[PDB]
Amino acid sequence: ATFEIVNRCSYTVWAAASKGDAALDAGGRQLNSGESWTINVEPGTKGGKIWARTDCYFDDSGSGICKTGDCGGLLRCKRFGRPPTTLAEFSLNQYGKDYIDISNIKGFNVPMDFSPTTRGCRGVRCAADIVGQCPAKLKAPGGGCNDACTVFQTSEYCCTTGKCGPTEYSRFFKRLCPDAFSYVLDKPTTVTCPGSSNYRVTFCPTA
Ligand SMILES: [K+]
C-alpha cells in the first residue's frame, strides 16, 4: 500500500511509522508545515501505526527526544511511541480486506484525518480541540492529553482482564471524537476497505 502523510499543521511534526518490531519504510521524518511524505507499506502488514511527534530535537546521528510520541529517542522509529499519541492504525490484505481506524486509547496529541485515496470505503477523523478541553488529571505538561490507563494504571482503565466498561475519561474522548476508539472495548469504529487500498494521513486537517 502507498500512504501519503501530510502535515497541514502550522507547526512542524516528526511523523513516525512502525509495526512495533520494525520501521515501516524509513520509520520517521521531519515534516514542516505543508510537507508530504509518501511511504510504501508491504502488503499483509498487520498492526501498523502512523503518528505525529511534537517538539523534537535530533542530532546528526538521528538520536534525541520528543515531548510527545518519542520512540526510544530515534528519528527513524522501530518501536511504538510514548503516549500521548493520536494513532492511525491499519492491517492490510487480511483475507482480501484492509482494516483501518483512528484510536485515542493512547491519548491524543495532534488532530488527524485518515482517508482512503482509492474507491470503496470512507475515511475517519478526529479533529476536535481535545488538548484545550482535556481534563486536568489527563493533561500532559509536554503537550497532549493522556489516556486514563497511562495516568492511573488501573485494571478498569487498562482493560487488563478483558472486561471493562466505558469511564468518565473514555466518554470525554468519545464525545469529542466519536469515530475514534476511546477505550479497549469500545464498539469498533474500524473501517473495512478493499484489500490493497491506498491512503492519506493528514495532520491538522481543518487547518
Ligand atoms: K484540525
Side-chain angles (χ1 to χ4, degrees):
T2 299
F3 288 71
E4 190 178 51
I5 301 167
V6 180
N7 183 19
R8 190 174 294 158
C9 309
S10 66
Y11 47 87
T12 301
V13 303
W14 289 256
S18 176
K19 57 179 189 79
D21 64 350
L24 301 174
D25 198 289
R29 217 199 93 157
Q30 185 171 327
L31 295 174
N32 298 148
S33 178
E35 290 190 329
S36 301
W37 176 40
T38 299
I39 66 168
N40 289 296
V41 173
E42 245 223 309
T45 294
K46 223 289 195 204
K49 310 195 194 295
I50 290 163
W51 67 106
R53 303 168 288 177
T54 63
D55 289 309
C56 304
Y57 165 74
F58 293 109
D59 71 14
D60 22 71
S61 76
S63 287
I65 189 165
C66 303
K67 293 201 184 176
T68 69
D70 188 89
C71 62
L74 298 184
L75 174 63
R76 300 175 209 70
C77 293
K78 280 65 171 180
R79 303 290 170 182
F80 296 138
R82 190 173 192 268
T85 54
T86 323
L87 294 169
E89 309 184 302
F90 51 88
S91 295
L92 308 178
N93 308 98
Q94 305 290 302
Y95 300 108
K97 300 324 287 251
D98 292 355
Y99 297 92
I100 70 168
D101 67 77
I102 299 180
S103 177
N104 291 141
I105 292 169
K106 294 291 181 219
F108 176 100
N109 61 342
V110 177
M112 168 188 289
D113 183 277
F114 185 9
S115 285
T117 58
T118 54
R119 194 152 44 193
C121 53
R122 61 162 290 217
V124 285
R125 180 181 291 198
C126 177
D129 186 18
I130 288 179
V131 178
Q133 300 298 356
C134 186
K137 291 176 179 189
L138 297 185
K139 287 189 65 67
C145 189
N146 282 313
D147 67 285
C149 172
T150 296
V151 172
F152 293 104
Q153 294 275 276
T154 73
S155 63
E156 191 66 16
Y157 294 138
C158 302
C159 215
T160 304
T161 65
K163 302 159 296 196
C164 59
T167 69
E168 196 71 15
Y169 297 123
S170 72
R171 288 182 183 95
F172 163 74
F173 290 96
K174 199 64 169 184
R175 191 158 37 236
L176 287 177
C177 285
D179 286 335
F181 279 86
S182 67
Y183 74 109
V184 169
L185 295 182
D186 202 358
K187 190 280 291 184
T189 52
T190 309
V191 175
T192 305
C193 291
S196 299
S197 297
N198 299 316
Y199 302 90
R200 192 184 214 247
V201 178
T202 310
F203 306 120
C204 304
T206 72

